[PDB]
């Protein structure tokens, strides 16, 4: 009832490294994490990001491989998360971890309903049902409200963390957020 | 003075301010020097983004106990001070850094209009140069073209934002990366 909110886009390289450390960190700090996927210029700036991600991975001993036409528009994966989530928030976190993990080993088109639905029976969900659910109008309206509520609450970018109403934007802000939680704020 | 950490920034940049309070000491701890390089190239979402940054600056400033009080109409187009830095460097690099240090201190305690040539020239004596000699230099069309060109060319070489640190060819963007960068210098890399 006082979770660390974890707002991210599945196509976010920085969210990938955050996704990954967030669970253990919140455990160390004795908090829960609420995972919240939501939808989101220069060549040289994109060239830098790539260098930075590779540089982060290399240091953490992580394998990191975005697909050739990164970033995917992860609409099917984002709809799938909230579909699962309505049934079981824990299954949804699990599903989210498997998206990041497959996406960033070059193994999942997160825009494809069909490809995303192959992740289901893995959270004990039939592809058919997941497929039906994300093709359901009420869920499509639900996911849209999630992101609009995000805008309305000042949430932008990925990863974005919200703890006790204090916002922290960025992967490199996780230790500051932790220091905020431990001290109670400054 | 051979392989410095290049410190690229905009004077009106809050995050560059905090880097500026830190860079020399880190560099001196690391056994490196710093090449200071100010440049002018450094419903929607940006009201949320601006509003986040000011909140973020205020808390960074509280935590470290630094003065952070931008002019009421922040950010200023810091054209005069940037030009002044390069005019100053021509005469003395060490003085250009002193001048730059001071500009940060003064701008972010609301004591300096960095868009004003007269106001900026007044920092001349503090560095050992005379205000109207400084005002002479920054009024020259060529220096104006030369300053701008440094920024333009930096952009073409893939320098963007504020602050941006280049050490031994390795780019580190943002106040947040000062920590990783230190590690990149100490460990020789990874
Ligand atoms: N994670 C922060 C930055 C986070 C970031 O800029 N991530 C991108 C996606 S990986 C983002 O916020 N989306 C673009 C946007 O801000 O609109 C860092 O350490 O550099
Ligand atoms: N990455 C941020 C810096 C990015 C940012 O929001 N600050 C501005 C200057 S105060 C910037 O670097 N501009 C980047 C751009 O123009 O894209 C940090 O941790 O310092
Ligand atoms: Ca200072």
Automatic annotation (TrEMBL), chain B:
One of its GO terms (biological process) is glutathione metabolic process. Keywords: Calcium, Isomerase, Metal-binding. SUPFAM superfamilies: Thioredoxin-like. The keyword Cytoplasm does not apply. Residues 5-184 form the DSBA-like thioredoxin domain. Transmembrane segments: none annotated. The active site is at residue 13. It comes from the Bacteria. This is 2-hydroxychromene-2-carboxylate isomerase.
């Amino acid at each position: 009832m006082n979770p660390i909110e974890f707002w991210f886009d599945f196509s976010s390289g920085y969210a990938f490294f955050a996704a990954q450390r967030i669970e253990a960190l919140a455990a160390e700090l004795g908090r829960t994490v609420l995972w919240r996927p939501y939808m989101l210029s220069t060549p040289l700036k994109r060239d830098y990001a790539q260098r930075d991600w590779a540089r982060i991975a290399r240091q953490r001993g992580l394998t990191f491989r975005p697909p050739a036409d990164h970033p995917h528009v992860a609409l099917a994966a984002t709809r799938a998360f909230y579909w699962i989530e309505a049934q079981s928030p824990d299954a949804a976190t699990a599903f989210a971890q498997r998206v990041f993990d497959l996406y960033f080993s070059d193994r999942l088109d997160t825009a494809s309903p069909e490809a995303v639905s192959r992740l289901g029976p893995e959270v004990g969900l039939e592809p058919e049902a997941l497929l039906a659910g994300i093709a359901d109008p009420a869920l499509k309206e639900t996911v849209r409200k999630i992101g609009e509520d995000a805008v309305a609450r000042g949430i932008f970018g990925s990863p974005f963390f919200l703890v006790d109403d204090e916002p922290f934007w960025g992967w490199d802000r996780m230790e500051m957020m932790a220091e905020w939680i431990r001290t109670g704020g400054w």
